[model samples]
Every structure is written in C-alpha cells, then in structure tokens.
Target: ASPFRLASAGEISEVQGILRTAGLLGPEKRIAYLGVLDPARGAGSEAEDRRFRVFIHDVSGARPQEVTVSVTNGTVISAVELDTAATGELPVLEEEFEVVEQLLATDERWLKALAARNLDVSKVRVAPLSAGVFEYAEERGRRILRGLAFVQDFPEDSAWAHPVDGLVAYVDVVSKEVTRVIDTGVFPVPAEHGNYTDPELTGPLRTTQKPISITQPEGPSFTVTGGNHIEWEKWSLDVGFDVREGVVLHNIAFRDGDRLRPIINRASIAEMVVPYGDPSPIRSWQNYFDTGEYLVGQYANSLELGCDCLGDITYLSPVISDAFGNPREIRNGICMHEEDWGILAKHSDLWSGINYTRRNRRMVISFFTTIGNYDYGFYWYLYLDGTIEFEAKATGVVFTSAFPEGGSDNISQLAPGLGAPFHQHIFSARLDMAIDGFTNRVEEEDVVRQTMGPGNERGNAFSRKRTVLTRESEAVREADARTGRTWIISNPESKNRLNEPVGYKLHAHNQPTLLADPGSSIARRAAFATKDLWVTRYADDERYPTGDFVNQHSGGAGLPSYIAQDRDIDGQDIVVWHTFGLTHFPRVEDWPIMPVDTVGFKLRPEGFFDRSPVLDVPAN
Candidate 1:
C-alpha cells in the first residue's frame, strides 16, 4: 500500500521532524530534497513502507549529507556527507534563488557594473543560474551560482524583456561574496519593450476571436480513488510524486474484457538537459539540467481553471518540503481530464450505403513547472485503443542576449538587437516495462526493402527485420527514420492468438539528440541524451539517468556509469531509457512568451491485444 500511498503533507512533516530530531536539520542547514526511496532490491521486488530520502546541505561547512529515514520505525537509517569536489553542489533550493537577488543588491562591484552601464539597480533582476563547471580556481569545488541579469522595469512588467548582457556575476552562496565578475563589454543594452500580454501596454485587443467554453455536464469520464490511483476507459495506473520528478506513474495496465492486463511497471521523465549551441565565449559555456540541477517539481505552477484546464477536472496537489524542512504543498500541481481526440474509427459499407464511426477520447495527466525564463509542461496521455503517449511542451520567453553583429549560425534575432541563442531541450524518460508481468525482453524492428532479385522480381518486396536485443550491449541504439525503426518490449512467456509475444511497440520521437561535442562539459554529464533508447537490466538504485547529484556533477555518472556494467538483459527485468526532445534554432516568432514547441513518443499495443481493442466502443 505504501507504493501507492506516497509522501503526504503530514508525512512530510513527520519526516522533517524525524530528521530534525536526529540533529540533521538546524541553523545554516537546509533540506535540499525529501522524497520516497526505492527498495534496496530492484523494481522487481516489493517496496518497503515509509522509507524516504532526505538530502540536507550544511551551508556553514558547505557539506551536503544524504540520509535515509523511516517514519514507520521512527529512526534515521543512514546519513553520509557527500564529497562536494566529486559530486558538485546539491540541487539549488528555492530560497537560494531569493537569496541571490538579495546578495546582488549589496555587492558593490555588481552595483558599480550596473551604475557604469547607466542602468538602475532596483529594476535589474538576477536569474540565479547553476554555475557551470569552469577552470576558475575560486569556482572549483565551491558553492557557486552565476547572476544572469535581466531588466524588469516594474512589479508586473515582463521579467525577460531586456537583458543586461556582457556581465555575469559569479558568487559563493555560503560565503556571500561575488567571487569574480566577467564583463565582455562587447554588446550594449537595447531600448525596446516586448510585453504583448497586457491590453494596456500592447493596446488594441483582438475582436476576431470568440470564446468556446468546455463543460462536461455528466462530469469527467475518469474516476480517481484515494487520489493516487486513476481509472479511465480501459486504462489504470497509480500516481506517485517526487521533489525532483513530478508525476511518476506506476502499475500501468489496460482492462481487457475480464482481465486487468499489465504493461509498464513504472514511468517518469528522469532527467532533462538544455544545452546552448553557441560557441561564443559569453554564451557558449551556458547550460542547465532542468530536472536535476533545478529540481523541476519544486517549482511546479499551481494550475488554474479555464486558463490551464477546461471541462470537469480533478486536480492533485503534491506535498513537498521547503528549504527549512517544512511541508509545502503546491495546490493543483497536477491536472487530470479527458479530451475528445477527433475520430477513433470510421468505415463505410459501399454495398448497403451505410457508414459507421466511433468517437475517440483520451485521458491526460499533466503538470507545468517554470525554470527561470522558460516554462515546461510534462503531459502523459492514455488513449482508448491501448496506446500511451508522453509529450514535453516547452513555452515561455526565448532566452535572449545582445544580437551578434551582422549574423551567426548560433543565434536567432528575436528583435532588432535581441539575440536568442540556439539550443536543444533534451529529455530522458524512464520506462520500466511489465508487459504481462515483470519478466520481459526487447527487440528493435526496422522495415527494409529489397531491390529486383529472384525473391523480388517486381522490386516491390519489403519486410520487417526484427533484431532481438539479447543483452545490454546490443540495446544501446538510436532512431533510424530511413529504416523506420521501432523498439518492442514484450513478455516472451505470454502470447496472443497467433502465438506472437504480447508486447507494446515504442515510437521513439525522431529528433536531434545532444548537439554539443562529446568532450564538452554539458555532453560529458548528459550521457543519457546521446541515444534514442537504452535497455538496462533493472537495478534498484538505478533510477535517475543523470545520477542523484546533477547540479554540477563530473562526467561518467549517469547512463555512462551504469551501462558500463553491461549486465545481461535477455528475458530479465529491464528498464528502457528513452531520450527525445527539440533542437531549437530560435525563430523570431518564438519571442515574448513563445508558442508551445511540443515533442513526444508513443507506446501502442502491438501483439498485446488479440484484436482491435476499441471494437466494443460505442458510437455515441
């Protein structure tokens, strides 16, 4: 039951008190993360109850400690101080972001820089950035953050409109000192406003558009029990949450006739990397690990009615911990509803002049989080025909710098002088398959065509080539659009009418992976983004693709670190790490809260169902 009854507000308070009672939380010490911990044994084993991971950072000595706590037993299991030099800083807390802005207010050097540029210090906003790894002696092994300055004229003004380019304030959070200031001084601040939201500011509200209200008079088609479990149509799954990864769906299955069939055991977006493509000195060394370094779920937006969702809706709020180790709940952090997806099926009977059609609907579970200037939405959709889809939506302002003179391949000009750097938002999804049960095998299938030969006299012979991935070494693969590649995770012990293995085929979204050079810092840390799909034998401790300490980690810790083991994966409990995302060149239309750039992957029942599952669906 603990697997389904995850961390709660009262339980978060209990865990905080447990850590505090054990002398782990106090003055100058902040809770970095507090969430559920998996069992020592892999996902194949039953999870123990009331077990949690508590990460606390001691700002005095800059020592970060990871502790295991059990509220059921009321004891601290283990607490170990991490090696900061090796693992880098713990995930940046919400309070640290506020503190950075306050620190920038007092720093005389930062003040002088603003004064010399003829800019008012009061209106300057500092985007606290995770200080990327560099060779600076002061920054090496230190608790550091870079203050990326932007100009926000007033309280409700667009925060990302103008930039105070060419200057980056590097500061040590614990020491409260600006260690060093880098001023390229090559680009000047431009004078232009890009606030298109307010009618007062932008003027001339559009009269061509009208409102179409969505209402579910009979309420939503989906039902929730105990909040954590959901049932819609033939789909069923448990909802779990974490401070790092927001909504973790588990025990995904489809109700087939008289059976609740199993499919994926667990699923979540484990890591995300946004790497800038510009090689310019000022912007080249910039990047962010949204899920790891920033702790995406910690900053989840409280979704609203009409604006964020429509129709009859059910909202689930996740309980998290503040920096001071107190329970903080984001109201309506997750939204669930049903959407009409055009037509499900249609066919015409020419003999009788009759046509039959069935309506298609899907259940959507989604949450949005704001990291600095950009907004990210993670949407998981379940369709009627036994298909699961995951979409990552990137919106909000395109991060801008001073436009490079003349032109450059690495930058896109949003305005006359507002240059948005080219970048890619790469995401890694952890899919733990359970097909019919835990035991499953995987294979890559690609469509191939033959030229004129004895077997293909008409030169129209084409067949599917299925390559079984027998081991971990053979499963590390990439998307091949030319060959029409797809990976199938199947239960070898289960079969359908034709004796084909019961399985689900994965449609890996074909897109560019990490474009940064392999030797670069961002690429070295984000090894999981290099491939489209990687199958690893499930290890209990192997959950995150970028490891636990990703704020400023060194190379060789995530997928590169685990895949090195290369254990056998054939017919064993396995996990599929799928990487997919967008390669953004930053169009001019993408400025001032850009439109959503959505990308995703799909999982459809291949041999899992004996026939079309929606055959029984009603035309109404």
Candidate 2:
C-alpha cells in the first residue's frame, strides 16, 4: 500500500510556499501557479454544469507530470498528462513474442504429460506460477523489517479458477504444488485491462453481423403497484423487500443531469416524473425506448410477468402514449449505486430491461455494487433502449476456486493480471449507446453493434466468449464480429493489451478498469469493489470529492501531480467495512450531480418472467 506519499513537512512547506511564490521550479514554461479549490464544486451545485479541475505538474519536462486543468468560470475543464512519451513505442518483446510463444507452445505439453506418467517432473520446472514479489518480515521497532515486498503467486496447474468470491492467492507457475484457483472475483475489473484479478478472455469470441440496432423508444419502466409484493428478506444470506405499497411504476430520472457517476444518475425520474421528452414523436432517442414504447404484460394480457409478486403491490401499469394521444405519467426510478449508500442486503437483485432480448422495447437498467456481500458483487446493466449492457457476475465464492501464487502460473494470466494493481483507483466506463437513437446522430442508419465482453457467467457451463464490437449502423456494411474495435480501457494507471480491442464513447465517464488480472485477489475484490463504489474523498483539498490525492491539470497550464497513492503497498490501503450513498438524494449538494438524474431497481420474480403476474396479490 504505497502508491507514493512521502512529502510532508507541512507538505514540503506547501511545495516550498507554492514554489517560492511561483518561480524557480520551472523549465521556462512558467504557468506554474497550480493550486486552488474553494471555488467549491467537488460535487457542488448551483444548477451545476459544475466544473473545476485545475491540476498542473510538468515538474518541468523530461516528464514532470500532473496535468488535467479544465475549468469553467474559474475557467478550464480539460487538461491532462503524464505522457509516457505520448503512449507509444514501449511494447517490445518482439511484440510479446507471440504471447510467450503461445504460453511456451501450449505449456510444453504439461512437461510431456509428466514425463510419460513417470511423474517427478523436476518440481514442474521450478514452481513460479506468475504473481511474484514477496519479501516478508514486518516488525520494525526491535528491527525485524527485512525486505518487505509483497505480491504473491502459487498455483499454475490444478486448473486455476476464481471468477469471484472470498478471494484466495498462491501462484505456482505450473503445478509445482500449490492449488486453490477460483479467481476473476474482484468486481468488474476488466473494462479492458487494468488487472483487478483479470482473466476474462474465455476465448472464441464472435459477434459481428453488422449489428448496431440501438433503439430505446422511451426509457424508464417499472410496475410493482399497490400492496407491494416482493419479500424475501433473507434467503441466500441477505435479500430484502418491503416496498409496503409504493406505486407510479415508471420513471426516467432527470433532475440534475451530468451523468457518469455523480452518486449516479440518468435524469431523476425523467424530468421530475416521466415527461417522456415533452413533445415526443419518438424520433430516435432510441425510438422512444426501443420501439414498443414501454409495455410489460400480465393483467389480462396474461403470461409474461414471471415470478411471484402476489403478496401485493404488483400493479405495473404504465402507458405513456403520445403521438397524438397523451397519457404520460411514467415515474419509476430506482437503479442506483453507491451501494445504495449502505447495507440493505440479504438477496438484493434489482434489474430493469434492455438486458438484450434483442433490442426493441429495450429498458435494461440495473444496480448492485455489492449486496449479499459474498456472490462477488458490482452488477450494472443499463440499456435505456439502445445498448447499455454492462454486466458483472460471480455470485458468491467462486473466483474460480482460488490460486495466484504458484502451482505453475499461467492461469489465463490470473484474470488479466489482476487489473494491474488497481489502475488509478479503478473507474472505467464510456458507453455511448445511441447507435441510431439520435441526438448528434452519427448515422450509418444509426450504427449499433458494440457488444464488449464478460457477462454470461451464471452457472458456468463455460461456452466461451471475450467481447469486443463496434459498428453503429452502416459503413458500407464492411465488417463482422469484434466490430470496429477501439475500446481502450486499462487500469493500474493503464496498460491492458493482451487480447486487444477497445472502443468507448457511451457518454464517457471516468473510464479505465481493465484489470484482466494484475495478479488476483479475485482481482483485488474487483478493483476494491469499484473503488468502493466510486472513490469518494480521500482528500487532498477542496474538502474532498475524489481523494487519495489527485491534482493533474494541463492546457490552462499549472500542472499539479498526485494521483492516489493510497498504499498498503498499492492495494490502495483497504478498510472500507461498509459505506452508502443510496439515492433518492438527501443532499450534500446532493454530491457531484445526484439530484435524481436516473434511478432503477427491481429483482423481478426470478425465473425469467413468463407468467404468475403476481397472481392476484395478497401473500406475505
């Protein structure tokens, strides 16, 4: 846990009194003022287009970093740098020599099948398995510190697992002995490659028939009406329920705007209460929410409802019609995450639609950064009718059964290198699913084929797919599968290129969790549970909106530099125990843009919804 923090003597005399009143610490390009934060807006709000990012570093060339300096009134909202020579050239190992010559030619046939079954393959070539780094000792005062370094690797053979759970690590390059397996259980770590615990390239990935169908005819939808019925409370540990009887089943959440994780939002019940867009004709916001315009079945239409809501409150009746008609009153908001702010778990599930049944009638909204605790949390699946299928699963202890220290190593590179030590406090997502939904209308018809990867891991039959697509309509229809390919997500600061395939625009939030397997603790609890639900306030200044040290601004000039060094070595310190932010917002400026931008939550009756439409209600 040592991301780097040793400057203190009053923070090095406040950086030598702001570099001796702004002079000297330069290389001639002197805009070095670099420091300021009470213009307020760490998440502050007036109507908040809220901009404040002034961080300068360029300690003065060669590579003296800290850049990002985009402001608004104080002026300057986008400047960033740490230029590793502008991201190029370093990759040489003969271009990774055909991935270590295809893992030493398919693992030299398990040492020629353990020397033709005679065994004793010389400790299987010296037992090193990958995740290396250990020094040990620890006592200091009486002096027993020793070297102290700390990574670990111990299981290579015995089929290293772990796609999710309690997390285990041991690293054995090739079955030298140790074997635990079960990894990939870190928490949404593979945005492309940062390494929370990595390892998600199950292989055989294919999906490109020119598929960019973005169509969300009208976004929000829900219907658990009157008497409310979905009570489980505690089955597989901590699932909860008791809406008592809340109604108004369909909202779009829209009151503060600025989405991309500001507590989290889409629009706070769509303009206060499902205004549906106001004068709608459904001209592409994905067709008003996937063509059908928002319709769920059951009541007398029969079938389709799925599980059992029969204890009451199952009246999901929404109709919003507005081409010439006019009934509008949508209101259904609840898809939130800051872990719902705090503990309300036992079996928490909540999902809404577009979870891709094909597309039209889309919906797919979701939330769950960690509910029942075990079951490897952090589940998001938003697709407001145009392709937002961000998913994550590993439900309860499975991280493939654990193993990263050593039986032999190569357990699929321990899940993308455990997402490279938590790439910059981990936060990566840039999903712009408008495909043909229109706003800026990038057209091809409207595109639509970005599949990406890592979902479909429930009972683990393990079919095989790695995800990576892009097409948004027609470019002469000249492509197939892994489509356009540009999604560059990479964490632990950024590196991820193992399988390569990057493209992201989906509104472009912070972006960058690609852990594939930086070593694995289930990829460090999936990059510390999405940096513990969005890294709020480690505090360097401005009363804290994103802390653990961050000050990199450029362009406006003044380059400050300090990007989270939380440490415990770089595990980012740890100690969260539990935290919360659950919206419906309460206020703290509502923090970073959470007046109710977009909300969603629901754990549909389970069995995939075909009938039982809450029977006639009345159970409990």
Candidate 3:
C-alpha cells in the first residue's frame, strides 16, 4: 500500500455526510475540519490494512473540543473527542474571516464611515488581524477575534494601496457579533492608485527579444522513484509534507563510491515572524507569526510549468485541508527540476597551454506560499559539489499604512501621501544533522585578526580559531561579520584522508537580528530571532522555534524555553536551528509591488569528502 497516497474526494465527502447524519455537525453544533492525521508508520494493504484519522473541531461548547474520527477502508471504526485545552491552540480557520466580513457589512457605524470616505462595501477587502489583540485578550482569559478592512480604489489595483486607515474592529466568533470598534481620526487618502501590471505606471523597462531556454536534450539527469523519493547523481532524499511547515526533506543522504552516507535526518522551515515597526495604536501591535497563526501549507500557491520553473519539471500534488476540514489535493504544489549553474570550476595551464572547464549542475525543488500581501518562494538546491542551499525569495506588495496629507516623521513616504513603515521578515530552519551517523558535535569556527606580536609586526594577519560547544547552554551563538564566524557540525569518529573530522558547516548571509528592544513584547514572543544560530539536543516534539501554541501566546515558549533545560549535547543526537532575516526600511522604489528580495543560508561539506566530489565530471 502507498503510505503517502492522498485520500480520495469521495472518501472525504462520505466522512462529512456520515458525521452530519450522526448528529455530529449542525448549525448549533459547529464543526470545522482540521486535517487528516496520517499514520505514524506505513500501511500494508489498501483495502483492509489502510486506516485514516480525520480531525474536526466542535466549537459549540464554551471551550472547543477536538474530535477525531478513525476510518478503516470506507467505514468509520470509531470516534473520539478530547478537550483542546490538553493540546495547544489550533489555527484560526478561513471561515472565520467570512463571518467577520458579514458582521461588519451590517454594522451601521462601519457603513457610515465608509460612506463618508466615498467607499462602497463591495469595494472593500477584509483581512484577519493576527494574534496581537488576541494575545492581550488571552492575558485576561478572553477569546476575541479581530479583522482589518481596506479600501480598493481601482478595480485592477492591489487592496494594500488604499487602506482604511485608523479603523479596526473586534468580533466574537461564538456570538458572531461585532463587540467593539476603535477609530482614530479619519485621514485623507493619498495617491496610491499605482497598478503593478501597468507598463506605463511601472516604467517601460524593456529587454531583448532573444529567446533563452534551458533544455535537457537527453532528458533530465535526475530520476524520481516511488512518489516522494528523488535520486540525483550523488544526492538522494525523501520529500514529506506537513500542515504547518509545508515541504520537508527526510533521510537526506549522499552517495560516495560504494556507500551511501547520511548527512541530515530531517530539514524544514520551522517558523517565520513579520513584525511592523509602526508605533501608532492602529498598527503598533501588528506582529504576525505566519506559520504558527496561519499554517503556510494551507496558503500554498499552484505552480505553473514554464513560468514558475524551467527544464523538464516534475510536479507533486499535496493533500491539504479545506476551510471546513475536508481533504483536497493542491495541484502542482511542488516543482522539481535540474538547471545549469554557470561554471563549476575552470583552470588553464599557461606553460602546457591546456584549458579545462566544467559546468555546474543542480537539482532544485521549490514551493511557494502567499501570506496575505506577500508571496514567498522557497527553494532547496543540491549542487554537484556537495552543497545544499535553502533560499527564500520575497515578492509582493508592502503592507502600507496611511499618512496625513503632508507626510509625518514617523514613517517613510513611498508615494505622495502614503507611508511605508519599517518591518522585519525573520525565518528559522530546523536541521537535524546526522553527519556520518547519529552522534555529532557542534563547533564554532571564527576567523579573527591576529594581535600585535613579534610574528605579525605589521598587525594585519588573521587566524582561524575553533571552539567546541559541549552543552546546549553554550551552543547558542550569533553570527559576527567582523570575525567571519561559522558553525560546524562534525562527527568525531568519522575522519577524512587528512585525519580531519568530517563535518558540514552552516553558512549564513544577510542575517540581521530582530531590531525590537529586548524587553518589548515582540522580542518576548519571537525569542528565536534574538540570535543567528542555536544548537540543542534532538527532541521529536520540539519542531517549531516559536513553540506549538503560538496563536495568542504571551511569550515564555519556543527556543528560550527549550534551551532552558541546558542538556549536554556533546557527541549526542543534536538539532541545529539557524535564523536568517532582514530589516526592511522601505524606499520609494518599492512603491506598488516590491521586487524579489532574496535571503538564505547554505550547508556545505567541510572536510567531509576525500576530494572535490564533482572533479570527475566531464566538461560541458
């Protein structure tokens, strides 16, 4: 039986109909579908041996109850309900947004304000405001939902351009009523009618009509076996999917001569945080944890063949839960292919007059997700020279807030009367490194300038210094550009021909730590963004950097709480967590839609191979 085969559409409809007939779903007893809980291990047979679990939420009571339905074949074997309090908070469902919009439409006060601005209800877009106000309510033992409404001036323009400034509303999900409204002084509209797709507005930047294409005349160099297993020239891995983390690679190994050696057990993007720097009451507390609050996988965008990827691309469809918890397949959720990577290496011997060059080849797998106004494209590349790269490309409209007719000093003016605030997009990757095997240690390698000594009279020399991290408490470190610092995960038992420990180095670039004050609420919730790197003992439960229940969480969780144990990580199964991010001070050039801003990190082999892994490749 196929372990990862998605459930059929008929099966999903059957389950929903069965639950409704059994009095499990109704208007009074609201039920929301979570996701299909897959088996812990593989299945054997499709008919009798196959089993599936569906999660549903019963929100009719004071507190929500998680309902689990077990199905074998096409029959419901059993149903179990448990209090959600035992587990962490569940993500806000997409249906909640519709409820908020409906409630706001009938609101007299909201309609009056919209009429004064000459905006129609049909021309407004309502977006759910994440955990800020929810966090404040959780402290007082209350559960309240909130949303922000924005005006759309042009039919083809983005909704972010015309924001309904200084207007916010809170709603009661259970009661389906708008409880309160907070309205600051009404501000005048700015000139924000720019369309990104309009050539006149975006400037006539033209390129040559020369045709460029990446063609594999002899077909692709990699083969995909089974459904999820991928095998390139020297690299192999299994692709897996999660509801929150999106794409994950498991049991990643590389083939060296006669043996296949282990490199990483699992690798994934744990979490991400986008915090706005505006201090006004309207936009002050707008820090969003995209992964925790809104599952990234659910927001995955479908990939096109020639547009999103080039070459002989293979597509993978992922199974995701709908707004009501029904199982559905997202077509072309992931795209895999091989591409030409300029030059691998080149050498020319002047005396012998011999030249040799080799073109680099890489296997890439990518997925894209749209979180509100921004779209993030993530790519994982396996290079011929034994290097793995994780890259994130950000593109979309900037979250713009309103400014007065004359710009104020509080924000940066992107347009005439529009202010684009400062913000940070921080991401963390959780890497479970096995190196040659399971037991591995972490060491910080720094290149520092040599002190004034007799050996270096000029005082311009530098040397490499290695520091072994024996415990989790000492393993948490930051990247210092002045010293050229990097972290190496090595296996003491595995050595190369030169008697050096085999290892993989974590190489990070463009990593700017969070600018929020240490004592601020944003810092407390996003504790993982305080540093560039962290190493801790492997724990199956600790998958997310910002804890499991980050929705409405008031800090005291995530990396800070996990590292508090201070477990000894020396020569043990360890997991490395690295944070990469950027500080965006918006400029005029980023008006309508911001261009792709790329940031990422690499895990390159260091003394892990006997020599250059791709040295034997034939020149192209």
Report the number of the highest-lDDT candidate: 1
> 1-620 in candidate 3: lDDT tens per residue?
34444445555666666666766655444444344444442234354333444445445544544454544444455666643333444566777767888888888888877787777898777777664533343323233566777777667767787777888877766566777767786876664585777787768767766767878788888887767888898897887776678888877899998889999988999998998888887777788787888888878899997788877888988776564536678899999998888899999999999998999988899999998888999899999998999999988888887766666555788876687778999999999888998789999999977787888568777789999999888878988887888889999999999999999988889468888889888898888998999898987557788876666666757888889899988888899999999788888888788988888899999999999998789866
Candidate 3 global TM-score? 0.89
Cα lDDT, model 3, residue 80: 60
Off by over 4 Å in 3: 1-55, 65-88, 116-118, 133-143, 198-208, 351-353, 405-410, 455-461
- Runs in model 2 deviating more than 4 A are 1-70, 74-390, 393-620
- Model 1 C-alpha lDDT per residue in residues 1-620, reported as the tens digit of each score: 54566578888888888887988888878888889875443435554556888888887865789999997788999999899788777898777787788888888888888888888888999888887776776676678888888888788777676887888887788877778777778467756777877776558976998998888888888888876889899888988888798889988989998899989988999998898887776667688988888889998999999999877789998889888878898999999999999999898999999899998888989999999888999999999999999998999888888886788888888887788889999999999889998779998999988889877478777889988898787788999989999999998888999998998999977998988788778877888888899999998778889888887667678887788888888788899999998999888778776999899999988889999999999867
Compared with the true structure, model 1 gives a TM-score of 0.96
What's the TM-score of each model vs. the native? Answer: 0.96, 0.22, 0.89
Scored by CA lDDT, what does every candidate get?
A: 0.85, 0.21, 0.77
Error of 2 at 290 (Å): 32
| Candidate 2 RMSD computed on C-alpha atoms after optimal superposition onto the true structure | 27.1
